[PDB]
Each structure stands twice: as structure tokens, then as C-alpha cells.
Design a protein around this ligand. Structure first.
Ligand SMILES: Nc1ncnc2c1ncn2[C@@H]1O[C@H](COP(=O)(O)OP(=O)(O)OP(=O)(O)O)[C@@H](O)[C@H]1O
Ligand SMILES: Nc1ncnc2c1ncn2[C@@H]1O[C@H](COP(=O)(O)OP(=O)(O)OP(=O)(O)O)[C@@H](O)[C@H]1O
Lengths: 465, 214, 72, 72
DNA sequence: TTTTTTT
């Protein structure tokens, strides 16, 4: 009782678990030791033609006809009901010919790599011979790395963060901070960007500046769409906001960028949600300024500093006189060509995985460093210098009461000029007049029609000198 | 390309176009002042795999409403990859292989000037005028020129008919053999631009503190 | 859904409940398309959906928020 | 071309290289479409292009700028 | 803000 032959062929193909359906509406196939999906080519027919050697002899002859292949594809589409979830392992690095385990280090190939439904890859094959610590390329690469970010007591704290942020690019989780590479010209940050791109293949992606300026929901926005399921997104050439007419990056969008999902749609599609598995790195020479500064913004900022100059001999003199640098080196003419030739593709992957094994093994999280945030520093200082009144200050109010304070309904009354003079004794009120005014009308409280008071008691008001 | 009118800018442009065929491209002014993310931009999407891009007729900036050259656009225009989406497509990456040449009669001015901008600027001057016999006399008393010659009537037709298509190609090949054999690189000329002349001296007559000078 | 042909999937799925002489006819895609066309032609009236506000849907059934037991 | 199937033109042009038994089969456009479908099915893996910066491409050949030799 | 995407 042998029925349709093409149905049997389709059933046997489906039994190998080589075609799967995702919740996004796409079909993924397992061909050439990788998971590939696309909406414009017949991948199912390619798989049917490719796997014809695993079937009995009486079945392989039927797959040469394209119409029979189309019939088998239609059957397979009919029998595929039930979606599956993909990209759920954050500690696995997919390649073209297998998946590398970042936890311990062995490389999986073939069926062993099938269980990890990694729908993306690095786009190139993995080679074991070049993945070794002792190679002529390693010493050359270490010299460049030490030149860009020298290791020393002065730079010991910044280099650790610089390597930790680069190492974080290997994970497939969501990151809660953004990276700003602040440096002058010829500081080697572009070389680092190119090295990272060559190391991580097409997982690296570059998008326009508009993902920080406009509204992400203003019609189609392929720039956000291309970010989907990436692990590193680079934005470049921040415009200078000091000059008039420049548009200051909104604080709203950076908070959205730290959410596990982003709202945006591509062309010829209606899907909105996109997985945010990537880290944001933006390189610039000017420190950015935000329209509004809030307490939520200091949990989502991180800055790396570049303080090395690679100058030609003709500019040897002036580079020494400039105070923004700390070391001057001779520019390498042929370095760019070697970088473009993927000369350090695996020597940098070894460094990346070695760094990953150092920091990111137990948990992935960063420690904020508010000790060096000059642009927000004053906003911190008041927060660390003002103590509000409470119940414990009620018994001691009388001593403060003789110092110009009136106990009206158990509320401390603070004259305006007293706080004006106290803050103007060190801060030039002319420079931050607008900022102080904004803080005031955001924090002003009306005791009555005329008198205005502040709900804080200065430490020096109660502590004897 | 800096020079007055009737100095051979368009003749050189057409000679290069006839020499290099489809590898030459002509693009609008929007790539220098207009934002590259304001929807689709086919002007920069047409630069894919091109080897020479020309833009001509820079307007004077003294006119009201004139937009000056953005420094950030210049900085991001020299990158190996340029971001731009042509119409009816989703691709946003274009490969940059072309030399950008701007033809103008006035010295350009930028909104912001910094050490980054001084590294990507070169200027070449045209100092020869071809004049008709009627108005040639008024050309010997002008400092903008150093030699006055007679206009050739039929040169444009010869240039159009691709008469010198291969001679120019041979000359270009000889020049490439002369210069770009070991390493190909273009070097900037900060001095020519007038507005930079301030900053160039700033790093010369000022020095920082020294341990011996403390 | 408006993209994949769920009708053909249903036709292929429920082929076991049909008599023995009808199951073998559903293994060909063209017959499935003809059956789908007939079904689409035979459907005229419409029905309103989601009329019960106190029911929580799942895959293995619907949970009732009044009593607390789970249908399946 | 992003909108024209040049594969059919290539199939028609490459006819003379094949033996005479297969030569007459390519005159029918439907056979050419079938061959194009087969070729598109067996074509997996992408190849990068334009990796040589010192070569000048022409319509009937490529010129080498290193030594001036012309290849066709 | 009319184009763009939509057809
Ligand atoms: N260790 C090194 N030794 C010598 N030359 C180096 C070294 N690292 C980089 N260089 C060279 O010095 C230059 C570094 O400048 P780069 O192109 O990185 O620009 P940048 O100012 O750092 O950044 P961007 O252009 O992205 O703003 C390049 O020409 C590079 O080839
Ligand atoms: N030896 C020569 N070299 C170049 N052009 C010549 C020469 N002899 C005569 N001419 C003529 O001189 C003219 C070249 O200048 P033309 O008036 O065309 O200005 P242009 O190149 O468009 O310059 P600009 O854009 O600065 O105005 C052409 O008409 C050309 O035929």
C-alpha cells in the first residue's frame, strides 16, 4: 500500500529536521553546515537538491526535475505547522562551518552545531591552525594594541574598560550602556573599529547618525531594521553641537536603545519588534551634550579615552606641544592595507576570547564610574552636598530658627538670598543662570503667594565650624 | 579646482570623462550641504564602485540663505563605507573607491574648523585664461592670470568626438607608473585655504608647560 | 493569517478522520487547492468573534475566571 | 542586471561549446528556462567582487597597471 | 511635508 512517492520523499526530508519555521514568518534551512534564511531565494529547493544523496536510489532520480522539487516544497510547506524559537544561547559564537563555545573553547561542527539555532554567523570559515597564541602575527598585533592603549599605572583603569567593552561584543545578550570613544584626530580608534570588524565578520554593522536624532517611528526606518540580531553597531562622526544650528541628541532615544526591544519597521514589511543583542559604540572628538539631564542618564553612559598620536615627522614638533596627547609615534603607512587584507583576523579573535574568559564568565554587568563625569559633575555635587530636613531636625530647629528661619506650620522657611549667596560664593551664577533657573522652576515650591522656601538644610548651617 | 572663468576646468573634466568612460560620475551639490539621512539619497547611492566623482559650480556663500560646507560631511565622506539608501531598496552600505573633485571659482568657507578638517584638504590653482580677440586687451592688466591665449573654436567638438580618448589614457597610465607604484596616498595642503591660516600659526607661537620650565 | 495557506494545512491535517477512500486523494497539492477553492466558495455568512470577556485563552484549552477549572 | 535574466542569454551564447547532441536542445526557450532554474538551484555560496585595486577594466579586457600588459 | 511606500 505505497501511496504518493513525492509525499514519502517530503516526509523523509522533514524527518531530518532540516527545515524549521520561526515566529517571524520565515523558513530556516540547514545547508552547508549552517542555518540560512532569506525571503527572496528558494532555499527549500536548494536543500531538496542538495540532500538528494541521503535518499534511496529509487528516490534520488525524481529530484532532478524542477517541477517535482516544487511539488515537494509545497508538501513540506503544508506539513510545517508549529513555530520554534531561535537565538537563545548568548555564549556561543557562530561561524560559517560551525559554532565555537566561549565557555570552554572547543569548536563544534556538523550535527553538534545543529542544536544551537544560530541564524547568524561571522560569514567566514574557522581555522584551527591560525587560532593559536604563538604566531608571528601575535607579536605584531600586541605592539599595535600597546601603542593605541599603553599599559601603565596612569592608564590602568581605562585600558581595562577599553578591553571589557570590546570583549562584550561576543555575547548575544542585551547591554544596558552605550560606549563613546572620545579622542582627537589620528588617535587610532578607526584602526580599532576596523580590527573589530575584521575579527567579527558581518556581525559588525554600521548605521547612520539618524538613530540618535530623529524619531524611530517616523515611517519606515531601515537603519533600525538592519540592527536586528547584531552584536556590534558603530556610529561615526558626531556633529559638533557647540555651533549654532546643531541638533542635540535627545535623552529619550538613548534610553530606548537600552531596552531589549526596539520599535521600527523596514520597507515591504509590517513587523515591528527587533531583538537588541548589540552594543552601541560611537567615536568622536567632542563630548556630546544632551537636551535634558536626568538621574536615569547616569546609568547608561560609558566613555573610553584615546590619548595617543600617530604623526608624520613633519608634524613631529607641534604634536609634542599639544597638551591633549601623552605620546607621539611614527605613523605606519602600510598598516591600513594589512588591516584590509584580514591579516589579524584570528590573532584578534584569540585576544577577544581571552578577554572574555577574564570578565564575562559569571555575569555580564558593568560598574558605573561617576568619579570622572565633568559635564555632569556639578549636578552630582549638589546631590552630595544638600541634606533635606526630617524629624530628627525638628528638636534642633529652634537653634536654626534664630538664624533667620521661621517655624510656620512646622515648615522650615529659607530666604532666597541666603541660598543665592551661598551658591554664588563659588559658582559664577552668570555662566549657569539658565541651568539654575531650570532646576529652580522644576523644584520650586510655593508656601504662599509671596514667600518661597527650599526643603533642604545646609550641612554648615547645623555643623559648627 | 580653484580658478577664474575660462581656465580649462570643464575641458579637463571632459577629457577625464572621455578617458575613463563609465567610471566617471557627476553628482549634485546636496552631498556637501544637505543631510545624508533625509530619506532616500540616490545622489550618494550612485557612487557605488565609482572611481571618480565630480561636483561643480559651488555657489557663493555671501548670498542670503546660502548653506556652507559641513565639516562632518567632509569627515564622513572619506570613509571606506558610506551610508545611503537609494529609492525602492533597503541597502544602506556603499563602497567608496572614487576621488572627489570640486570645481569652483571662490574660496570655500566651513562652519567649523579643527585639526581633523585640515587633514583632508587639497587645492590646485588654474592660472591661464583663453580669451576672444575682442576682449583680450582687458586681460593683460589682471593679476588673476599669468598668461592669456586665444580661444579655440573647434576644440570642444574634438573633445566630444573622443579624439583624445586613448592619448589621455596613456598619459594617465604613465603618471600612475610615475607616482602610485610603491604606495598610493594623497596628502593635504593646509596652507592654500585662507581661513585656516589662523589655526596654522596658533600651534607655532604657543607652547605648553615643561617639567624644566615649571 | 493572511499570508500562509492555513486552509491547506487544515485539509492535510484532518485527512485521517475522512473515510479510507478519501485520504489518498489529499496527498496531491492540486487536489488540496481545488478543495480549498470549493470551501472558499461555500462560505458566505460571517460570525462574530471574542464574545466572552471572562475567558483566558491558551493552546491546550481555555481557562475560566468564574469557577476556576480549565477547559481543553 | 537587477531585473533581467541574463542567465538565459548566457545559456544561448554558450551553446556552441557543448556537443552537438545538447546544442539543438537549447533553441527552445522553455528548455532554457528549465536549465536556468536548475542552475539557480545548484548555485549556493557568494563570492566577493572587486578586490584588485590596480586593474583597469574595459569592455573587452582588463589592463594591468603594474606592467602595462593587457589581458583578455 | 511632499514625497516615499503604497500599488
Ligand atoms: N600602532 C600604530 N603604529 C603606527 N601607526 C599606526 C598605529 N595605529 C594606527 N596607526 C596609523 O595611524 C593612523 C590612525 O588614525 P585613524 O585612521 O585611526 O584615525 P582617528 O583619528 O584615530 O579616527 P577617525 O578617523 O575614525 O576619527 C592611521 O593612518 C593608522 O594606519
Ligand atoms: N590649450 C587650450 N587648453 C584648453 N582650452 C583651450 C585651449 N585653447 C583653447 N581653449 C578653449 O578655451 C576654453 C576653455 O575654457 P572655458 O571657457 O570652456 O571654461 P571652463 O573650462 O568651463 O572653466 P570655468 O568653469 O572656470 O569657467 C574652451 O572653449 C576651449 O576650447
Amino acid at each position: 500500500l505505497d501511496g504518493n512517492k513525492l509525499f514519502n520523499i517530503a516526509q523523509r526530508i522533514l524527518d531530518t529536521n532540516s527545515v524549521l519555521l520561526t515566529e517571524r514568518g520565515d523558513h530556516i534551512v540547514w545547508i552547508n553546515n549552517s542555518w540560512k534564511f532569506n525571503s527572496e531565494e528558494p532555499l527549500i529547493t536548494k536543500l531538496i537538491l542538495s540532500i538528494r544523496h541521503q535518499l534511496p536510489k529509487e528516490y534520488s532520480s525524481e529530484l532532478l526535475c524542477p517541477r517535482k522539487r516544487k511539488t515537494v516544497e509545497a508538501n513540506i510547506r503544508d506539513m510545517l505547522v508549529d513555530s520554534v524559537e531561535t537565538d537563545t544561547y548568548p555564549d556561543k559564537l557562530p561561524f560559517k562551518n560551525g559554532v565555537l563555545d566561549l565557555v570552554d573553547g572547543m569548536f563544534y561542527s556538523g550535527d553538534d552545531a545543529k542544536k544551537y539555532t544560530c541564524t547568524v554567523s561571522t560569514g567566514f570559515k574557522f581555522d584551527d591552525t591560525k587560532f593559536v597564541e604563538d604566531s608571528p602575527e601575535m607579536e605584531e598585533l600586541m605592539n599595535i594594541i600597546n601603542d593605541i592603549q599603553p599599559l601603565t599605572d596612569e592608564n590602568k583603569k581605562n585600558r581595562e574598560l577599553y578591553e571589557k567593552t570590546l570583549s562584550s561584543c561576543l555575547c548575544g545578550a542585551t547591554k544596558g550602556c552605550l560606549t563613546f570613544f572620545f579622542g582627537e584626530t589620528a588617535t587610532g580608534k578607526s584602526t580599532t573599529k576596523r580590527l573589530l570588524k575584521s575579527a567579527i565578520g558581518d556581525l559588525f554593522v554600521e548605521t547612520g547618525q539618524t538613530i540618535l536624532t530623529d524619531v524611530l517611528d517616523k515611517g519606515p526606518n531601515p537603519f533600525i531594521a538592519n540592527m536586528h540580531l547584531k552584536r556590534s553597531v558603530f556610529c561615526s562622526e558626531l556633529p559638533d553641537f557647540a555651533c549654532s544650528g546643531s541638533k542635540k541628541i535627545r535623552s529619550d532615544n538613548i534610553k530606548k536603545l537600552t531596552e531589549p526591544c526596539v520599535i521600527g519597521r523596514p520597507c515591504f514589511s509590517n513587523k515591528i519588534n527587533n531583538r537588541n543583542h548589540a552594543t552601541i559604540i560611537i567615536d568622536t572628538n567632542y563630548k556630546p551634550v544632551f537636551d535634558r539631564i536626568d538621574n536615569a542618564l547616569m546609568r547608561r553612559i560609558a566613555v573610553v579615552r584615546f590619548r595617543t598620536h600617530f604623526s608624520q615627522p613633519s608634524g613631529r614638533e607641534a604634536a609634542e606641544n599639544n597638551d591633549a596627547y601623552d605620546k607621539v609615534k611614527l605613523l605606519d603607512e602600510g598598516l591600513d592595507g594589512k588591516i584590509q587584507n584580514n591579516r589579524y583576523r584570528f590573532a584578534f579573535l584569540y585576544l577577544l576570547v581571552k578577554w572574555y574568559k577574564k570578565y564575562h564568565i559569571p555575569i555580564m554587568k558593568l560598574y558605573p564610574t561617576p568619579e570622572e563625569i565633568p559635564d555632569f559633575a556639578f549636578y552630582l555635587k549638589i546631590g552630595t552636598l544638600l541634606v533635606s530636613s526630617s524629624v530628627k531636625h525638628i528638636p534642633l530647629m529652634t537653634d536654626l530658627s534664630k538664624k533667620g528661619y521661621i517655624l510656620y506650620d512646622n515648615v522650615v522657611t529659607l530666604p532666597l538670598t541666603t541660598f543665592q549667596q551661598k551658591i554664588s560664593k563659588y559658582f559664577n551664577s552668570r555662566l549657569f543662570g539658565h541651568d539654575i533657573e531650570s532646576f529652580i522652576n522644576r523644584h520650586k515650591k510655593f508656601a504662599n503667594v509671596s514667600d518661597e522656601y527650599l526643603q533642604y538644610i545646609f550641612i554648615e548651617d547645623i555643623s559648627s565650624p
